[PDB]
Amino acid sequence: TLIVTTILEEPYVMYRKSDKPLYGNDRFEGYCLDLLKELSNILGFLYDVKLVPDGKYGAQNDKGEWNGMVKELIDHRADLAVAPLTITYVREKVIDFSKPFMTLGISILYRKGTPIDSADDLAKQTKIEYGAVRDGSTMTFFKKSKISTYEKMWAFMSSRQQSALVKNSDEGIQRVLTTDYALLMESTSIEYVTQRNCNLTQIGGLIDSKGYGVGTPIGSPYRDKITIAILQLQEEGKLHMMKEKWWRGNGCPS
Amino acid sequence: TLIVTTILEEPYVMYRKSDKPLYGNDRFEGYCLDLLKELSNILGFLYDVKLVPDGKYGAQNDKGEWNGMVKELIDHRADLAVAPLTITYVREKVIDFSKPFMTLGISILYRKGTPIDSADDLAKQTKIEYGAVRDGSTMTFFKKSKISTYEKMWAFMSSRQQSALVKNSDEGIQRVLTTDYALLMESTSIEYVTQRNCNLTQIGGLIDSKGYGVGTPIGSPYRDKITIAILQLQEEGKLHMMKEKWWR
Amino acid sequence: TLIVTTILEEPYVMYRKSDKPLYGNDRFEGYCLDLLKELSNILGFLYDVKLVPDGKYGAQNDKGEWNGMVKELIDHRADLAVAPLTITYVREKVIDFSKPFMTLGISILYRKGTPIDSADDLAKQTKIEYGAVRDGSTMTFFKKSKISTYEKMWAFMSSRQQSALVKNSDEGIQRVLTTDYALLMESTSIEYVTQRNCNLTQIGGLIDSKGYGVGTPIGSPYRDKITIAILQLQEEGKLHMMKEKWWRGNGCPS
Amino acid sequence: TLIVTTILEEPYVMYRKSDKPLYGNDRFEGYCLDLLKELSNILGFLYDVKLVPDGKYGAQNDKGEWNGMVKELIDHRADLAVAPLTITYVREKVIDFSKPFMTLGISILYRKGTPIDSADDLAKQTKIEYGAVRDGSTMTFFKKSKISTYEKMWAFMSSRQQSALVKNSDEGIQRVLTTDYALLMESTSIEYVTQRNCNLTQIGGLIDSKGYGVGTPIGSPYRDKITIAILQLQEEGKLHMMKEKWWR
Ligand SMILES: N[C@@H](CCC(=O)O)C(=O)O
Ligand SMILES: N[C@@H](CCC(=O)O)C(=O)O
Ligand SMILES: N[C@@H](CCC(=O)O)C(=O)O
Ligand SMILES: N[C@@H](CCC(=O)O)C(=O)O
């Protein structure tokens, strides 16, 4: 019954590995699939997980058109977007969100051992290239900012958009590992990467503070039910357990 | 024009100190008044600040009846609750909230140098009394919990006719200072209090994670308008500045 | 039989909480205490845990005299030092160390939300006080450094009868929470603190890279044996489990 | 004077490319050769570099005899071993090691674009082959491991004896490049290899944590001197510069 739009993004949504045959929903796994399971059992709904065709989170182009999971909701093509979808004021204008299931902030993924310590440092040089995932909320934060440092950074990433803006986080990560590039990435995803790719680290602190919410078309009769369910899972300690399960690891030596 | 219900709690809402007599909204100062001033400018509304008459945040009795700021919104005696009001699943069933303007978790406030290291420490002893603000979300978190350790804690704090609970955070801070008592208090508040009193400290880390949001009655058109304005204030760095200003 | 010198330092060595009578080794708990049981079982020795009387890790004063746990090993007053004792070149000239049981680097503990991004930022000002634990290896790092940013930091933390230095980590943490002060602290301790004290954070990356080792006096019959045991425990995954056990926690929202 | 045993391994020990022929020590370049030069100047000694004849790191045979670089030291055939030689307890019982000059952990080197994410993914199946460098610490780690996942992986990589265990890292790399195969390799090497070959990637995180040390024969008159030198080189930011240099 319910159509769920989502996007590949480790460890939130990933393709499951099995020698066995996977049917529909079982093709996927991750933090967001476990959350989506909880939600369907608590609220009593059936659902069909569909990956967003353009593989984008969602941004409004200059024409005024949206793409990504946000457009799927606006156009009523999906009933819910269950993904690390960031809650922002530009999106609240066109779709609804549940209270957040996880908090995060934009920060920087880069290599260890360099003199770079802040966005300010990146803004003050051009040797190191830097950017964010195209049509993501990080890119939009930079595009719409009136703060000097971030305007200068947007001017830089914008002029190089074809190299600076990446298709997705996986591409951004490979770019940091193999070229002199820093990715503007959400903190939770940075935490995940840096406990595996031990030559990478977070640079500086968090640039902002926000959260991931389940998206719904404006006025959906599931928004509040979902908000209530998430808030209750939080209070029962089940979201912490989910987080530990997907982020758990041996880490890296210092 | 808009009727705003609120509650006294430092540094969110405090009586402005002055020689001459202050009237109306001018009697109040704090992080939430700055936030409210920002929202009124952005949104273009006038407002009137009224302290909730029963002095409570809001909980439901076993009869199904609410009190505090929550009941003011439910009963349509206020348009907005602009206070350090926690977003909880029990309150979402009766009122609406904007997305959070601040994040926090339940933690423990106690005097320094003692024995206690965490809520588990507290749950297995009775020498140190412990409690929470009556009819606040912290109290309700323990009351509704199915986690054995929190169930044990709720049993201890609700017996003896709830003598372990306090009427408000100030009565809680004074009790922590005058006797062997630990207050289950929200982290943002503990961070303010422990900067102001070197006798006090936070024990353990956070028990949970949640947010404060502006409360409105269900279906209010201001719900989303305020969500957008708060989210923009966050993104422009304005909320961070307000926090710095009030947390010293 | 064996005398083990140690020092209180959360969560490595702490007094156990108990309304009952606690004697001998049972009076203590913590990561180092679990390490110590493993070692006593693997090597088969009996032991008595004894806090270092001066309560210091150990440094050599301008007069030339060692103090702390280091001095206890030199004077054959302790058979082992089991604690978060940093392996350093100055110490290695006077005592022996097992291979590292844990890695770490010096970094900065300060409050969240400021413009300070690195040691460089602190070295160029005076309004923000900064320092380290007196007579520990981080103090000796700044005292012995020939790197100019660090030489400038030593000059500061070292002035006015060393007012910027603290007696222990606890006092340093309080000073950070209650005054405009930044503590130079090892990364493993910062991790523990910042996961409980949500308004505090690590500033910049790691200044250096080192490890903690079990210390013994030069010529110790248990020297190589202890080293074999640590390496094996590491290989068997036991040290990772001990770390997860003592650092486990809920974390802070973003 | 001093005979230093080593083994070719990028980017620690490699042959310098030159138009004119190169002789003796000048035939080699790399992180480990730079470390050796620094040790030479700190301690004041002359040395000669001789790749270990068998080209192996070290592993004690199914009897009790040692091969490769470990062997060389045991038999006093080499004064030192300056190479990416892993500090392990098995080796600790027959040779001395300095304190580590570099940290790392076993991880997986595979091809990109697959649902394979960890060692658990490799272990629970058998279509994709996986192995390690015959007679290195990685092999020995799986061999001596009592951890269920790793014993099962050693079961597989041993019954697949020939095909699964490779001669050296180059052969392993090649096998990953031209076959459905995942090589178990130390993280520092995978970091190097992957920067220089975009079709290769690290799979999952680190299996363990350990270090590389300069090896010497039991009770060598240079043990303590080398340890102190390496510790001082780190503290003066020099081992860090050598790392940035060879890994770009
Ligand atoms: N969570 C982001 C995607 C990642 C990013 O923008 O950095 C979004 O919802 O657009
Ligand atoms: N913020 C709480 C009040 C304080 C507390 O309960 O700790 C509430 O909304 O009820
Ligand atoms: N671990 C240090 C003490 C703490 C510090 O110096 O930061 C030592 O062995 O001296
Ligand atoms: N560094 C390893 C060789 C490479 C490996 O075993 O993965 C050793 O000393 O044995």
Write the DSSP assignment of C29-61 as a string of letters: ESHHHHHHHHHHHHHT--EEEEE-TT-----B-
CA distance A13 to A6: 8
Is residue B164 located within the same domain as residue B194?
A: yes
Q: Are the CB atoms for A36 and A82 separated by under 8 Å?
A: yes
CA distance A108 to A193: 12
Count the neighbouring beta carbons within 10 Å of the beta carbon of residue B71.
22
Closest residue in C to A250 (Cα–Cα): C240
Q: Are the CB atoms for D14 and D64 separated by under 8 Å?
A: no
Strands D129-131, D181-186: pairing is parallel
CA nearest B197: which of B174, B180, B179? B174
Is residue A95 located within the same domain as residue A113?
A: no
> Does A236 contact chain B (CB < 8 Å)?
yes
Residue with tokens 């000048």, as numbered in its chain: D26
Q: Are the CB atoms for B188 and B83 separated by under 8 Å?
A: no
> Does A240 contact chain C (CB < 8 Å)?
yes
Is residue B15 located within the same domain as residue B94?
A: yes
CA nearest D7: which of D37, D38, D40, D50? D50
Query: CA neighbours within 13 Å on the CB side: how many for A17?
Result: 16
Spacing, Cα B180 to ligand 1 middle (Å)? 48
Is residue B178 located within the same domain as residue B216?
A: no
Count the neighbouring beta carbons within 10 Å of the beta carbon of residue C176.
24
How many Å separate Cα B35 from the centre of its chain? Answer: 15
Is residue B96 located within the same domain as residue B154?
A: no
At position C131, the amino acid (one-letter code) is G
C-beta of C132 in contact with ligand 3 (< 6 A): yes
Alpha-carbon Rg for chain C, nearest whole angstrom, is 18
| Ligand that comes closest to the CA of residue A66 | 1
Query: CA neighbours within 13 Å on the CB side: how many for A46?
Result: 2
At position C72, the amino acid (one-letter code) is E
> Does D142 contact chain C (CB < 8 Å)?
no
Q: Are the CB atoms for B96 and B217 separated by under 8 Å?
A: yes
B81 CB burial (10 A radius; 0-12, 13-18, 19+) = buried
Question: Cβ contact (<8 Å) for B235 and A146?
Answer: no
Tokens (6 digits) for C247 = 């650092």
What is the number of structural domains in chain D? Answer: 2
Tokens (6 digits) for A120 = 């300010």
Across the interface, which of A17, A19, A250 has its CB nearest the CB of D205?
A: A250
C-beta of D131 in contact with ligand 4 (< 6 A): no
DSSP D27: G
Count the neighbouring beta carbons within 10 Å of the beta carbon of residue C249.
15
Residue with tokens 């393709």, as numbered in its chain: A15
Beta carbons within 8 Å of A20's beta carbon, 6+ residues apart:
none
Residues of D within 8 A of C99 (CB-CB) are 87, 92, 97, 99-100, 211
**Residue A171 sits in a domain of what CATH number?**
3.40.190.10
- Rounded to a whole number of angstroms, the distance between the first and last alpha carbons of chain C is 49
Question: How were these coordinates obtained?
Answer: X-ray
Is residue A10 located within the same domain as residue A30?
A: yes
Is residue C44 located within the same domain as residue C99?
A: yes
CA distance C100 to D47: 29
Query: From the alpha carbon of C85, which atom of ligand 3 is closest?
Result: 9
Closest residue in A to B137 (Cα–Cα): A235
Q: Which of C54, C107, C134, C137 to mutate to test the pocket of ligand 3 (most atoms within 8 A of CB)?
A: C137
> Does A20 contact chain D (CB < 8 Å)?
no
Q: Is A27 annotated as a binding residue?
A: no
Query: From the alpha carbon of A186, which atom of ligand 1 is closest?
Result: 7
Is residue B10 located within the same domain as residue B43?
A: yes
Is residue C16 located within the same domain as residue C74?
A: yes
Beta carbons within 8 Å of B167's beta carbon, 6+ residues apart:
B55, B133, B134
CA distance C16 to C25: 10
Beta strands in A204-248 (DSSP E): 210-212, 215-217
Closest residue in D to A173 (Cα–Cα): D201
Is residue B159 located within the same domain as residue B172?
A: yes
Is residue B215 located within the same domain as residue B225?
A: yes
Closest residue in C to D208 (Cα–Cα): C235
Is residue D6 located within the same domain as residue D97?
A: yes
Q: Are the CB atoms for C235 and D141 separated by under 8 Å?
A: yes
Q: Are the CB atoms for B59 and B158 separated by under 8 Å?
A: no
Alpha-carbon torsion angle A173, A179, A183, A187, nearest 10: 50
Domain containing C148 equals 105-209
Q: Are the CB atoms for C110 and C247 separated by under 8 Å?
A: no
Tokens (6 digits) for C228 = 């074999």
CA nearest B230: which of A75, A97, A224, A220? A97
Beta carbons within 8 Å of B40's beta carbon, 6+ residues apart:
B46, B47
Spacing, Cα B189 to ligand 2 middle (Å)? 10
Alpha-carbon Rg for chain D, nearest whole angstrom, is 18
D219 CB burial (10 A radius; 0-12, 13-18, 19+) = exposed
Spacing, Cα A39 to ligand 2 middle (Å)? 27
Q: Is B138 annotated as a binding residue?
A: yes
Q: Are the CB atoms for A85 and A57 separated by under 8 Å?
A: yes
CA distance C35 to C58: 21
CA distance A123 to A67: 29
Beta carbons within 8 Å of C235's beta carbon, 6+ residues apart:
D88, D89, D141, D144, D145, D208, D210
CA dist list (Å): A7 to A137, A195, C110, D66:
14, 22, 37, 52
Beta strands in chain A (DSSP E): 2-6, 14-15, 28-29, 47-51, 80-81, 95-97, 102-104, 106-111, 129-131, 181-186, 200-203, 210-212, 215-217
Count the neighbouring beta carbons within 10 Å of the beta carbon of residue C59.
23
